[PDB]
Design a protein around this ligand. Structure first.
Ligand SMILES: *[C@@H]1O[C@H](CO)[C@@H](O[C@@H]2O[C@H](CO)[C@@H](O)[C@H](O)[C@H]2NC(C)=O)[C@H](O)[C@H]1NC(C)=O
Ligand SMILES: *[C@@H]1O[C@H](CO)[C@@H](O[C@@H]2O[C@H](CO)[C@@H](O)[C@H](O)[C@H]2NC(C)=O)[C@H](O)[C@H]1NC(C)=O
Ligand SMILES: *[C@@H]1O[C@H](CO)[C@@H](O[C@@H]2O[C@H](CO)[C@@H](O)[C@H](O)[C@H]2NC(C)=O)[C@H](O)[C@H]1NC(C)=O
Ligand SMILES: *[C@@H]1O[C@H](CO)[C@@H](O)[C@H](O)[C@H]1NC(C)=O
Ligand SMILES: *[C@@H]1O[C@H](CO)[C@@H](O)[C@H](O)[C@H]1NC(C)=O
Ligand SMILES: *[C@@H]1O[C@H](CO)[C@@H](O)[C@H](O)[C@H]1NC(C)=O
Lengths: 367, 85, 367, 85, 367, 85
């Protein structure tokens, strides 16, 4: 059991406190270093499992040894002595540049940094597949491939006497989290006059019991049996937008198709939802066009009325009705039109606060 | 047809449908394994033809390595055994 | 004529429906594949036009064949058998890593994906110029260069028996769109006291008949005879910001020069607009300084008053007046000051909604 | 001096000028051409010196290729001739 | 002394005006070019200081000469004539692709562009360390390393007769700016019920006399003796958010821990601030748990009450009290909860403007 | 304990602390130095084995270089000596 000297250190984040303790627990012992220093001195491979009975295996990687062994040494008795040194000299500078990029000053707090195995790719010789294979990853299924690429490293020792960096790795394993469903949302445009709108919702949202949350898909990859994320992906959603997703159409905002737009129909639950004011819809079974009531904004096409529909030139057989017949626009409460470009948001907000600071001075006069 | 929180019917009236759901899996780290980046290559079979280039490389590395080494030592000097209390 | 089985497939976007039909129409016939499989087996080039009379040419690309042919085979009788296999083994793993990056699970829906020719660069051997030349692109003018780099590919067949990927490409051609003018906007700072402001407008906007639109220049490159975009670039603009650009100065927001700022003058229509409170303006013809009326915010410099002006040390001859003499600040309605950093927007919005939820409870009391 | 929608005079009073206009050109795709990425190189003039490395490469590729092949086959099995109706 | 022909040029930014004058002042003389053209013709190095007595040194860089000199020429009497040309031909196309990427049409205004030395890395042969060493940079301390990587180049001549590009470089030096302190901010979560909130403030802010500013850390690297930025980093902050940082807790917004969250404690001024409702806090000296008053949101742990505390399993000795004992939540004015995802901001803003446009029509009726 | 603008006490009541300050240094450019990218390599010791590849490279470069050369010449033709006034 160890204690952190908090008064001396004075200030530290939880991330820095926890990495420091982990640093103490995971760093090699003072004499494991002299042994490691000696084992490194006598090896000559690009990748090598350093096995000392008693201690655990230490994986040693040398970023330019394959180049020396494959390209320079077989040339030893065909090229001049300057040329061998010049050839290697170019490689060493390119390697130094990568060390500088990764461990240099752009690395904000090296002590608490967790460096992805992929970021180490160049430092490890330009590829990580043999390194992973030595650690037990085969590449034989895509989940194991994803897990391996979630490995992160922390720095535990930097040796200025023999020039090597000891890192500690941890193995990722997958944690399915109980209640949380990720949902992918998709909109189609609708017409008011000749204007094409669509309702603005996030590409992914998450449900979590009663709560609806925002979902950042940046760090996720969508396998067939679940979304696998390397980061927290869940984030709060405003009550107003949650109400939108709960059925309050007036709460959802909407924006124009100002440009080109490729979503005027979609296949859903075996039905076609189509803006048949903006594209040609046609029943293939009967040969008759499908016009969209001009006081309706969408058409919901099912086999009760058209078993096989042609839609913008694409012919689709549909199943039995799973969405009700379109209602009149006057029976749909639309929400506010907005623009999402960030400078428009700031300009309209700046106006709104100014009107609102105004409004408190008339509501002094009338009260 | 799935159901729950999100109200698929009323959203469909304003052109929004769900086109796929999935469970949510996050990664946890456990255990440990040491990896050492050996910065000095084995050059003996090159018979000193690369001495100048190696020495300059080693010199460039120190500028990068020394500040990290100092930071690691600064931290562990604040990590004591329990009983100093 | 083919039909999509919509009830079976159940759910699909327009993009997925259209790529699937295109997949059926563009995939090689079952026996074109056995012929292709046999033609690939017997070839030995990095790039090769596979011509079978009757069928169209198929361009075959092998990502490591140049390395084998140029580097390994001439070494066959100078290097050991392990070393040849080790040399190639490094190349194959680096190639596998790139295939994994491009076609692996991070590729969200491979069926409807459109992969740029540039993203294929490594899969095609590290460069695309000879591939394009075989397709008829010379590199002889910059428009043809831009068009070639807008080529996108779709996947039409993945062979696990002989390990090859068939892609279908389409050729871009340029569509000038009728009414739409892209305009680049540029501001100069002005002084209220010693405070330097500038009005916040987008870098590019687009006019389209009566409408002003936002313009995303991310996917565009600005040739001398037009803006060429690989994506839709047009997007809606709020009525409020459109009014700003239509002459309503009170509708435009503004923000500080909190930092350093290099736009205190600009040459426009042969005149100089300059914040001559913040830099030294001087008439070179007469030798006399130009002071900015302290109740004015800018100076509009023309040859009616100074044929050759010196401005922050730069000497510019100007032409006849195309902008009126500056007016007093009190004759200019300035709009709201705002800050654009996203966390400031959220903090001020959160305050505004709270005051606005307040305001409805006093407007129950007074009504 | 161009004119139109945007009100250059009143904008110039608050320091905004236009410094260039251009027409707007978008790209359209037409026609077709097949490109095949040949994943297995021709190695016969290397006389089996690379058998282990090639076999391992081919094995790594399957894990990536099989799911795409399955997705393509899944789609075209839902693409039928017209008259099945 | 030179003058810019402003009527002819008609329109230009200050950046373009200033680069043009600098272009005139820094371009090589007409006969320095013929001399340079002849010196280039006769050299054969990758990097070479071209010294002509009288004129200053000109550093000449040839992007594929090391490859020719080290790899092709020693092979001259072992490989066929096609193969040498094929080997180089691959290198030349890869080099052309990089020239196209950097100097081609994606370079918006080449005349006024300032190209970082790092962006030139490939054009200069894949590495910049020997180029910098010839210019006097040793790599011996990290500040000199940072300064060297802030070098920017402008284009001063493009020769279509002999195919070379003359660039003019300038040397960065460090300017500490007088009054400005950069501050890094860090929050811990607190509990209302079982809900974990934290207050939303920027990661970095800057103080500058009386003003608090936003700070964009994108272009900065955090050395031990100062923040070094390649760009202006200072930007305005809204009065509302400045009031938040000045002690007005009601002005700071707050958001949920919707997901996982690793900041439930922090070491600060030798004390521990901890959400001891969300993790186990324990006094190690006495062995007694530290419960958080359920009507308090945080615990401020000091040596007046616990010299050595255990916190989520980590044992920390703390110093004397520097933060007062937690107060009751009812004595803390919390600000608005918000969500920062940009589509939530737009949806709530769109609602707020609509209610606010409503509000002006009732305030006509009651007045 | 530092003090100033930012009110550390009241922020600490809502979980916010400062974990580091630094001075602010910006970069200034001065002086000049010419760097020339020599686009044509020296190939004489390759005895014309690369003529086709060099000629094609040189041809590809012109398309990129000519527009920049034109822009530079367009500007300096508007940069005159003082006395033309
Ligand atoms: C789905 O549709 C409509 C929204 O258009 C909802 O009906 C509204 O209900 C509110 C009260 O909840 C009434 O004040 C409105 O008058 C109704 N709107 C209209 C246009 O008639 C319906 O309840 C929605 N379902 C859900 C779960 O919100
Ligand atoms: C250009 O300038 C001014 C704005 O400063 C406009 O004049 C205003 O016109 C409105 C009605 O349209 C009046 O209520 C204001 O009293 C005027 N403002 C001032 C300060 O006098 C002028 O119309 C603008 N031109 C356009 C097209 O908007
Ligand atoms: C620090 O804490 C509180 C905010 O919670 C401040 O006290 C408030 O002061 C205002 C007037 O300035 C009063 O109207 C409020 O009644 C007080 N709030 C409460 C909950 O009692 C205190 O002044 C703050 N310090 C600073 C510099 O703002
Ligand atoms: C490098 O390689 C040889 C052979 O593996 C090894 O025995 C030797 O100790 C290493 N060289 C040095 C300087 O340690
Ligand atoms: C590889 O190359 C030779 C010569 O082009 C060709 O005839 C042979 O069929 C190819 N090898 C294999 C295994 O197909
Ligand atoms: C290339 O190299 C030789 C030796 O440096 C030099 O003398 C010659 O002039 C150069 N070749 C050409 C075509 O200029």
């Amino acid at each position: 059991g160890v204690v952190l000297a908090g008064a001396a250190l004075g200030v530290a984040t939880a991330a820095q406190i926890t990495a420091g303790i982990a640093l103490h627990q995971s760093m090699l012992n003072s004499q494991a270093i002299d042994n490691l220093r000696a084992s490194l001195e006598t090896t000559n491979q690009a990748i090598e499992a350093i096995r000392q009975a008693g201690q655990e295996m230490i994986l040693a990687v040398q970023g330019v040894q394959d180049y020396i062994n494959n390209e320079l040494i077989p040339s030893m008795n065909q090229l001049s002595c300057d040329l061998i040194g010049q050839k290697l000299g170019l490689k060493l500078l390119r390697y130094y540049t990568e060390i500088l990029s990764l461990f240099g000053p752009s690395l904000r707090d090296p002590i608490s940094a967790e460096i992805s195995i992929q970021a180490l790719s160049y430092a490890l010789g330009g590829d990580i597949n043999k390194v992973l294979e030595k650690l037990g990853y085969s590449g034989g299924d895509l989940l194991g491939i994803l897990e391996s690429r979630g490995i992160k490293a922390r720095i535990t020792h930097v040796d200025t006497e023999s020039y090597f960096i000891v890192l500690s790795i941890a193995y990722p394993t997958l944690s399915e989290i109980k209640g949380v469903i990720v949902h992918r949302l998709e909109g189609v445009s609708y017409n008011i006059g000749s204007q094409e709108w669509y309702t603005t919702v996030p590409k992914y949202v998450a449900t979590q019991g009663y709560l609806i949350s925002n979902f950042d898909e940046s760090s996720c990859t969508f396998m067939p049996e679940g979304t696998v994320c390397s980061q927290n992906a869940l984030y709060p959603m405003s009550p107003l937008l949650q109400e939108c997703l709960r059925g309050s159409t007036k709460s959802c905002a909407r924006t124009l198709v100002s440009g080109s737009f490729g979503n005027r129909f979609i296949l859903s639950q075996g039905n076609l939802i189509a803006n048949c004011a903006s594209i040609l819809c046609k029943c293939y079974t009967t040969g008759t066009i499908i016009n969209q009531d001009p006081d309706k904004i969408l058409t919901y096409i099912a086999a009760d009325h058209c078993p096989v529909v042609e839609v913008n030139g694409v012919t689709i057989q549909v199943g039995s009705r799973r969405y009700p017949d379109a209602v009149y626009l006057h029976r749909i409460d639309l929400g506010p039109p907005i623009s999402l470009e960030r400078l428009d948001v700031g300009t309209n907000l700046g106006n709104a606060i100014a009107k609102l600071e105004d409004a408190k001075e008339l509501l002094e006069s009338s009260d | 047809t799935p159901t729950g929180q999100i109200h698929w019917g009323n959203l469909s009236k304003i052109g929004v449908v769900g086109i796929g759901s999935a469970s949510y899996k996050v990664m946890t780290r456990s255990s440990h394994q040491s990896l050492v980046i050996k910065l000095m290559p084995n050059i003996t079979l090159l018979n000193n033809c690369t001495r100048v280039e190696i020495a300059e490389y080693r010199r460039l590395l120190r500028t990068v390595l020394e500040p990290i080494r100092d930071a690691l030592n600064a931290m562990t000097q604040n990590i004591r055994p329990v009983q100093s209390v």
